[PDB]
Coordinates of C-alpha atoms and ligand atoms in Angstrom, one line a residue:
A1 CA -5.3 -38.9 7.0
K2 CA -6.9 -36.3 4.9
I3 CA -6.6 -32.4 4.6
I4 CA -2.8 -32.6 3.6
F5 CA -1.5 -29.7 2.2
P6 CA 1.2 -29.2 -0.8
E7 CA 4.4 -30.3 0.5
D8 CA 6.0 -27.0 -0.1
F9 CA 3.1 -24.9 1.1
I10 CA 4.8 -22.0 2.8
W11 CA 3.7 -22.2 6.3
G12 CA 4.8 -19.0 8.4
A13 CA 4.4 -16.4 11.2
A14 CA 4.1 -12.6 11.0
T15 CA 5.2 -9.6 13.0
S16 CA 5.7 -5.8 12.7
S17 CA 8.6 -3.7 13.2
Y18 CA 7.1 -1.2 15.7
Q19 CA 5.1 -3.9 17.4
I20 CA 8.0 -5.8 18.5
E21 CA 11.4 -4.3 18.1
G22 CA 11.7 -1.7 20.6
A23 CA 14.7 0.4 21.0
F24 CA 12.7 3.4 19.7
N25 CA 15.4 6.0 20.0
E26 CA 18.5 3.7 20.0
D27 CA 21.3 3.6 17.6
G28 CA 20.4 6.7 15.6
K29 CA 16.9 5.7 14.7
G30 CA 14.5 8.5 14.1
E31 CA 11.1 9.2 15.7
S32 CA 8.1 7.7 14.1
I33 CA 4.4 8.9 14.3
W34 CA 3.7 5.7 16.4
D35 CA 6.4 7.0 18.7
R36 CA 4.5 10.3 18.8
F37 CA 1.2 8.8 19.1
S38 CA 2.2 6.5 21.8
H39 CA 3.7 9.6 23.9
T40 CA 0.5 11.6 23.3
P41 CA -1.9 11.1 26.4
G42 CA -5.1 9.5 25.8
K43 CA -4.1 7.7 22.6
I44 CA -3.2 4.2 23.9
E45 CA -4.8 1.6 26.4
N46 CA -3.1 2.0 29.8
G47 CA -0.7 4.4 28.3
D48 CA 1.4 1.7 26.7
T49 CA 4.2 2.5 24.3
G50 CA 6.2 0.6 21.8
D51 CA 9.0 2.0 23.7
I52 CA 10.4 -1.3 24.6
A53 CA 7.8 -3.9 23.2
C54 CA 9.4 -7.3 23.2
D55 CA 13.0 -5.9 22.9
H56 CA 13.1 -7.8 19.5
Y57 CA 15.9 -5.4 18.4
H58 CA 18.1 -7.0 21.1
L59 CA 16.6 -10.5 21.4
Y60 CA 16.3 -11.3 17.7
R61 CA 18.7 -14.1 18.0
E62 CA 16.6 -15.9 20.5
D63 CA 13.7 -15.3 18.4
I64 CA 15.1 -17.1 15.3
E65 CA 15.9 -20.0 17.5
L66 CA 12.3 -20.0 18.8
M67 CA 11.2 -19.9 15.2
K68 CA 13.6 -22.8 14.3
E69 CA 11.8 -24.6 17.3
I70 CA 8.4 -24.1 16.0
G71 CA 9.6 -25.0 12.4
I72 CA 8.1 -22.2 10.4
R73 CA 9.4 -22.1 6.9
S74 CA 9.1 -18.4 6.4
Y75 CA 8.9 -15.3 8.6
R76 CA 7.0 -12.2 7.7
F77 CA 8.6 -9.1 9.5
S78 CA 8.4 -5.5 8.9
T79 CA 11.4 -3.0 8.1
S80 CA 11.1 0.2 10.0
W81 CA 11.7 3.1 7.6
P82 CA 12.7 5.8 10.3
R83 CA 15.3 3.4 11.7
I84 CA 16.9 3.2 8.4
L85 CA 16.3 6.7 7.0
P86 CA 15.8 8.9 10.1
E87 CA 14.5 11.7 8.3
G88 CA 12.6 9.7 5.7
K89 CA 15.1 11.0 3.2
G90 CA 18.7 11.8 3.0
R91 CA 21.3 10.2 5.1
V92 CA 21.3 6.4 5.6
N93 CA 21.7 5.3 9.4
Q94 CA 24.1 2.4 8.9
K95 CA 23.5 0.8 12.2
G96 CA 19.8 0.3 11.5
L97 CA 20.5 -1.3 8.2
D98 CA 23.0 -3.8 10.1
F99 CA 20.2 -4.9 12.5
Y100 CA 18.2 -6.2 9.6
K101 CA 21.3 -7.4 7.7
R102 CA 21.9 -9.5 10.9
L103 CA 18.3 -10.4 11.1
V104 CA 18.1 -11.7 7.5
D105 CA 21.3 -13.6 7.9
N106 CA 20.1 -15.6 10.9
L107 CA 17.0 -16.2 9.1
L108 CA 18.9 -17.5 5.8
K109 CA 21.3 -19.6 8.1
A110 CA 18.3 -21.2 9.6
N111 CA 16.7 -22.0 6.5
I112 CA 13.8 -19.5 7.2
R113 CA 12.4 -17.5 4.3
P114 CA 12.4 -13.8 4.9
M115 CA 9.5 -12.0 3.5
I116 CA 9.8 -8.2 4.1
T117 CA 7.0 -5.6 4.5
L118 CA 8.2 -2.3 3.5
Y119 CA 5.7 -0.1 5.3
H120 CA 4.0 -1.2 8.3
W121 CA 2.7 2.0 9.4
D122 CA 5.7 3.6 11.1
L123 CA 6.0 6.6 9.0
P124 CA 9.1 8.9 9.9
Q125 CA 7.8 11.6 12.0
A126 CA 9.8 14.1 9.9
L127 CA 7.8 13.3 6.9
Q128 CA 4.6 13.8 8.9
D129 CA 6.0 17.2 9.6
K130 CA 5.7 17.9 5.9
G131 CA 2.2 16.7 5.1
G132 CA 3.0 13.0 6.0
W133 CA 0.8 11.0 3.3
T134 CA -1.3 14.0 2.1
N135 CA 2.2 15.2 0.5
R136 CA 2.7 13.6 -2.8
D137 CA 6.4 13.6 -2.1
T138 CA 6.0 11.0 0.7
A139 CA 5.2 8.6 -2.1
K140 CA 8.4 9.5 -3.9
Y141 CA 10.7 9.2 -0.7
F142 CA 8.9 6.0 -0.2
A143 CA 10.0 4.6 -3.4
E144 CA 13.5 5.6 -2.8
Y145 CA 13.6 4.0 0.5
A146 CA 12.2 1.0 -1.3
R147 CA 14.9 1.1 -3.8
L148 CA 17.5 1.4 -1.0
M149 CA 16.3 -1.9 0.3
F150 CA 16.1 -3.9 -2.9
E151 CA 19.8 -3.0 -3.7
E152 CA 20.8 -4.0 -0.1
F153 CA 19.1 -7.2 0.1
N154 CA 19.3 -8.2 -3.6
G155 CA 20.5 -11.8 -3.3
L156 CA 19.0 -12.3 0.1
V157 CA 15.4 -11.4 0.4
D158 CA 13.0 -13.1 -1.8
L159 CA 9.3 -12.0 -1.1
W160 CA 8.5 -8.2 -0.9
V161 CA 5.4 -6.7 0.4
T162 CA 5.1 -2.9 -0.3
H163 CA 2.4 -1.9 2.1
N164 CA 0.3 -3.5 5.1
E165 CA -3.4 -2.7 5.2
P166 CA -3.5 0.8 3.4
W167 CA -7.2 1.0 4.3
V168 CA -6.7 1.2 8.0
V169 CA -3.5 3.3 7.7
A170 CA -5.6 5.7 5.7
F171 CA -9.0 5.7 7.6
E172 CA -7.9 4.5 11.1
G173 CA -5.1 6.9 11.0
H174 CA -6.6 10.1 9.4
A175 CA -10.6 9.6 9.5
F176 CA -11.2 8.2 13.0
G177 CA -7.9 9.3 14.2
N178 CA -7.1 6.4 16.7
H179 CA -4.0 5.4 14.9
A180 CA -1.0 7.5 14.2
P181 CA -0.9 10.2 13.2
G182 CA -4.2 10.5 14.7
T183 CA -6.0 13.1 12.6
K184 CA -9.9 13.1 12.0
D185 CA -10.6 14.2 8.5
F186 CA -12.2 11.8 6.0
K187 CA -11.2 14.0 3.2
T188 CA -7.7 13.7 4.1
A189 CA -8.0 10.0 4.4
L190 CA -9.2 9.7 0.9
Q191 CA -6.1 11.5 -0.4
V192 CA -3.8 9.5 2.1
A193 CA -5.5 6.3 0.5
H194 CA -4.6 7.5 -2.9
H195 CA -0.9 8.4 -2.2
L196 CA -0.4 4.9 -0.4
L197 CA -1.7 3.2 -3.7
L198 CA 0.6 5.6 -5.7
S199 CA 3.8 4.9 -3.7
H200 CA 3.0 1.2 -3.9
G201 CA 3.1 1.2 -7.7
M202 CA 6.2 3.5 -7.8
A203 CA 7.9 0.9 -5.5
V204 CA 6.9 -2.0 -7.8
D205 CA 8.3 -0.1 -10.8
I206 CA 11.7 0.2 -8.9
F207 CA 11.5 -3.5 -8.2
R208 CA 11.4 -4.5 -11.7
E209 CA 14.1 -2.0 -12.8
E210 CA 16.4 -3.1 -10.2
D211 CA 15.7 -6.9 -11.4
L212 CA 16.0 -8.6 -7.9
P213 CA 15.4 -12.5 -7.9
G214 CA 12.3 -12.5 -6.0
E215 CA 8.5 -11.7 -6.3
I216 CA 6.6 -8.5 -5.1
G217 CA 3.2 -8.0 -3.8
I218 CA 0.9 -6.1 -1.4
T219 CA -1.0 -6.7 1.6
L220 CA -4.7 -5.7 1.8
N221 CA -7.0 -6.2 4.6
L222 CA -10.3 -7.9 3.3
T223 CA -13.4 -8.4 5.3
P224 CA -16.3 -9.8 3.6
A225 CA -19.5 -8.0 4.2
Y226 CA -23.1 -9.3 4.4
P227 CA -26.8 -8.0 4.7
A228 CA -28.5 -8.5 8.1
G229 CA -32.1 -8.2 7.0
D230 CA -33.5 -9.4 3.5
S231 CA -34.1 -5.7 2.8
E232 CA -32.9 -4.4 -0.6
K233 CA -32.0 -1.4 1.5
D234 CA -29.6 -3.8 3.2
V235 CA -28.0 -5.4 0.4
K236 CA -27.3 -1.9 -1.4
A237 CA -26.1 -0.9 2.2
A238 CA -23.6 -3.8 2.5
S239 CA -22.2 -3.5 -1.0
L240 CA -21.2 0.0 -0.1
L241 CA -19.3 -0.9 3.2
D242 CA -17.7 -3.8 1.3
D243 CA -16.5 -1.4 -1.5
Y244 CA -15.4 1.0 0.9
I245 CA -12.8 -1.4 2.5
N246 CA -12.3 -3.9 -0.2
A247 CA -13.0 -2.8 -3.7
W248 CA -11.7 0.6 -2.9
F249 CA -8.2 -0.9 -2.9
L250 CA -8.6 -4.2 -4.9
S251 CA -9.9 -2.3 -7.8
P252 CA -7.3 0.4 -8.4
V253 CA -4.6 -2.4 -7.9
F254 CA -6.0 -5.2 -10.0
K255 CA -8.4 -3.1 -12.4
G256 CA -6.8 0.3 -12.7
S257 CA -9.8 2.1 -11.5
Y258 CA -11.6 3.2 -8.1
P259 CA -15.1 1.7 -7.7
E260 CA -17.2 4.2 -9.5
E261 CA -20.5 4.2 -7.4
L262 CA -18.5 4.9 -4.1
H263 CA -16.0 7.2 -6.0
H264 CA -19.1 9.2 -7.0
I265 CA -20.7 9.5 -3.8
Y266 CA -17.4 10.6 -2.2
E267 CA -17.0 13.3 -4.8
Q268 CA -20.5 14.2 -4.4
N269 CA -20.4 14.9 -0.6
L270 CA -16.8 15.8 -0.1
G271 CA -14.7 17.3 -2.9
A272 CA -12.3 15.4 -5.4
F273 CA -9.1 14.1 -4.1
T274 CA -6.2 15.4 -6.0
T275 CA -5.2 12.9 -8.5
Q276 CA -2.7 13.4 -11.4
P277 CA -3.0 12.0 -14.9
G278 CA -1.4 8.5 -15.3
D279 CA -1.6 7.9 -11.6
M280 CA -3.9 4.9 -12.0
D281 CA -1.4 3.4 -14.4
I282 CA 1.4 3.4 -11.8
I283 CA -1.2 2.1 -9.1
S284 CA -1.9 -0.8 -11.2
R285 CA 1.4 -2.0 -12.4
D286 CA 1.6 -5.8 -12.7
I287 CA 2.6 -7.6 -9.5
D288 CA 3.3 -11.3 -8.7
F289 CA 1.1 -11.9 -5.8
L290 CA -1.5 -10.6 -3.5
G291 CA -1.3 -11.0 0.3
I292 CA -4.5 -11.1 2.4
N293 CA -5.1 -10.3 5.9
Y294 CA -8.3 -11.9 7.4
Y295 CA -9.9 -11.8 10.9
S296 CA -13.8 -11.9 10.5
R297 CA -16.8 -10.9 8.3
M298 CA -19.1 -7.9 9.0
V299 CA -23.1 -7.8 9.1
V300 CA -24.5 -4.8 7.8
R301 CA -27.9 -3.4 8.4
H302 CA -29.4 -0.2 6.7
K303 CA -30.0 2.4 9.4
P304 CA -29.8 6.0 9.1
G305 CA -27.3 7.1 9.9
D306 CA -24.6 9.5 11.0
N307 CA -22.7 8.3 8.0
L308 CA -23.5 8.3 4.1
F309 CA -24.2 4.6 3.2
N310 CA -25.9 4.9 5.3
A311 CA -25.2 1.8 7.1
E312 CA -24.3 0.4 10.6
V313 CA -22.5 -2.8 11.6
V314 CA -24.4 -5.4 13.7
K315 CA -22.9 -6.7 16.7
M316 CA -23.5 -10.6 16.7
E317 CA -24.0 -12.9 19.6
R318 CA -21.5 -16.6 17.4
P319 CA -18.5 -16.9 19.6
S320 CA -15.9 -14.0 19.3
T321 CA -12.3 -13.2 20.2
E322 CA -10.9 -11.0 22.8
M323 CA -11.0 -8.1 20.2
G324 CA -14.6 -8.5 19.9
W325 CA -14.2 -10.1 16.7
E326 CA -16.8 -12.6 15.5
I327 CA -15.1 -15.8 14.8
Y328 CA -16.5 -17.2 11.4
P329 CA -14.0 -19.5 9.4
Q330 CA -15.9 -19.9 6.2
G331 CA -16.0 -16.3 5.3
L332 CA -12.2 -16.9 4.7
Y333 CA -13.3 -19.4 2.1
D334 CA -15.7 -17.2 0.5
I335 CA -13.3 -14.0 0.1
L336 CA -10.2 -16.0 -1.2
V337 CA -12.4 -17.7 -4.1
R338 CA -13.8 -14.2 -4.6
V339 CA -10.7 -12.3 -5.0
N340 CA -9.7 -15.0 -7.4
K341 CA -12.9 -14.7 -9.4
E342 CA -13.3 -10.9 -9.5
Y343 CA -9.8 -9.5 -9.4
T344 CA -6.7 -11.7 -10.2
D345 CA -5.1 -15.0 -11.3
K346 CA -1.8 -14.1 -9.5
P347 CA -0.9 -16.4 -6.5
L348 CA -2.4 -15.7 -3.2
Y349 CA -0.9 -15.6 0.4
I350 CA -2.7 -15.3 3.6
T351 CA -0.3 -12.7 5.1
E352 CA -2.2 -12.4 8.4
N353 CA -4.8 -14.6 10.4
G354 CA -5.1 -15.3 14.1
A355 CA -6.9 -14.3 17.3
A356 CA -6.4 -12.8 20.6
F357 CA -7.4 -15.1 23.7
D358 CA -7.1 -14.4 27.5
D359 CA -4.1 -16.3 27.8
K360 CA -3.0 -17.6 31.3
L361 CA 0.7 -18.5 31.9
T362 CA 0.9 -21.6 34.2
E363 CA 3.4 -21.6 36.9
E364 CA 5.6 -24.2 35.1
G365 CA 5.7 -21.8 32.0
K366 CA 3.1 -23.7 30.0
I367 CA 0.0 -21.9 28.2
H368 CA -2.7 -24.3 27.1
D369 CA -4.3 -22.1 24.6
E370 CA -6.9 -24.4 23.2
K371 CA -9.3 -21.8 21.9
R372 CA -6.4 -20.4 19.6
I373 CA -5.8 -24.0 18.5
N374 CA -9.4 -24.5 17.2
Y375 CA -9.5 -21.0 15.7
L376 CA -6.3 -21.7 13.7
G377 CA -7.5 -25.1 12.6
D378 CA -10.9 -23.8 11.6
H379 CA -9.4 -21.1 9.2
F380 CA -6.7 -23.6 8.2
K381 CA -9.1 -26.0 7.0
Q382 CA -11.2 -23.2 5.1
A383 CA -8.0 -22.3 3.3
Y384 CA -7.4 -26.1 2.3
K385 CA -10.8 -25.8 0.9
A386 CA -10.1 -22.6 -1.1
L387 CA -6.9 -24.4 -2.4
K388 CA -9.1 -27.5 -3.1
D389 CA -11.1 -25.4 -5.6
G390 CA -9.7 -22.9 -8.0
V391 CA -7.5 -20.5 -5.8
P392 CA -3.6 -20.5 -6.1
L393 CA -2.9 -20.0 -2.3
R394 CA 0.8 -20.3 -1.7
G395 CA 1.2 -19.7 1.9
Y396 CA -0.3 -18.9 5.2
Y397 CA 1.3 -16.5 7.9
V398 CA -0.1 -16.9 11.4
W399 CA -0.5 -13.5 13.2
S400 CA 1.5 -13.3 15.2
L401 CA 4.9 -15.0 16.0
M402 CA 4.8 -13.5 19.4
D403 CA 2.6 -11.4 21.6
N404 CA 3.3 -7.7 21.2
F405 CA 1.7 -4.2 20.9
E406 CA -1.8 -4.2 19.6
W407 CA -1.6 -0.6 18.6
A408 CA -4.3 1.4 20.5
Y409 CA -4.9 -1.8 22.8
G410 CA -1.5 -1.9 23.8
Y411 CA -0.2 -5.2 25.4
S412 CA -3.9 -6.1 26.5
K413 CA -4.2 -8.3 23.7
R414 CA -2.1 -11.4 23.0
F415 CA -2.0 -12.8 19.4
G416 CA 1.2 -14.8 19.8
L417 CA 2.3 -18.3 19.2
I418 CA 4.6 -17.4 21.7
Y419 CA 3.9 -15.8 25.0
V420 CA 5.8 -12.7 26.1
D421 CA 6.3 -12.1 29.8
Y422 CA 7.1 -8.3 29.4
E423 CA 7.3 -7.6 33.1
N424 CA 9.9 -10.1 33.7
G425 CA 12.9 -11.1 31.6
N426 CA 10.9 -10.2 28.6
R427 CA 11.4 -13.9 28.4
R428 CA 9.4 -16.0 25.8
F429 CA 7.2 -19.0 26.2
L430 CA 5.8 -21.3 23.5
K431 CA 2.2 -21.7 23.6
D432 CA 0.5 -24.9 23.1
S433 CA -0.6 -23.7 19.8
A434 CA 3.0 -23.0 18.7
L435 CA 3.9 -26.6 19.4
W436 CA 0.4 -27.8 17.7
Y437 CA 1.5 -25.7 14.8
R438 CA 4.7 -27.4 14.6
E439 CA 2.9 -30.6 14.0
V440 CA 0.8 -29.2 11.4
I441 CA 3.8 -28.1 9.3
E442 CA 5.8 -31.3 10.0
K443 CA 3.1 -33.8 9.4
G444 CA 1.8 -31.5 6.7
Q445 CA -1.7 -31.9 7.8
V446 CA -4.2 -30.5 10.2
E447 CA -6.9 -32.9 11.4
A448 CA -10.7 -33.1 11.8
Ligands
NI1 NI1 -2.5 -6.6 13.9

């Protein structure tokens, strides 16, 4: 037919260390802020924790086989800093490294390509006991932990991602305080944001220095923003929102500056966050690819306004996912061709896209997840289009490989290609979407 992708397009799926591994205190692993946040009453839906999750730490071999079965060509996973360096610094917990050495090794022997995400949110709680990310030191320790892992997987691991979604880490975790470490101080969020960006660059410096065979990049969450009404008071009010999530990390990375309008209104109202001459040079070291997480677009309407933009986000009623996320596949086209136009020529990876539906497990272990199938197809076709015009899209990682711990929502939301029956064997069922996806990869083509 048509809509056939490059033959060596990297089709993959993604997970995260805290969300799937479990074994939270097992084998010398140290306490993370997510362990903390989790065991704090009132933080997670239904009082869920990552304490066991999918028991991936123990079932990883089964999981590779399940990957093999879906036929994915790359697997994006997160590497737990506290499990490897329990204090964040100092002594290396060997048994924790061995785990990932084992994982990688199965991945390679099954001809699946590892892409490792260095920091997927699970900061060691001992670093949080110094400032956490408001402490410059944390950036320095991140780099060292980054160095450790480069050295270890030198010949083995090919694609590296320093950070997953700095924006949310910063704002969700230190502004609105419904992610670890749970703080609520917009000022400290701005500082955290700056130190994440910093540590990123430091890591990419160490990368080049160590001279590992692969390519390094970073994963930002982009969400295009658009004006509700025709108002000029809306356009201006959406540009803000957009720069507040997107330009605010894109610019420092690719252009070596924060976005001035916002930079200025921040400093106006709150203070200055402490920079340090030559920081913006570290932040914008040359990288080899950008990684993009997309789920939806936002509609912004001017309306004063407890905040200072002074905007609000309009709930639509388009069809939506179980998270309440407006399904709107073309926005993904827009945003891909946009990053390419305004920010970088470097190759692009969709490192996260997917949706949660209200899955029902059939008595014979079947899960006919039609809605998911459609959602994936829709966004899959949009990527094809971006590909069909300028953009150097190299791969697409479906969130997620399996159902897992949806942070504050806990296990109430299932994003998997594989359905996970926690309460039972913690046993795994391939959804229809998984099997449908096996075909998209093999035949090399989706289908409208
Ligand atoms: Ni997620």
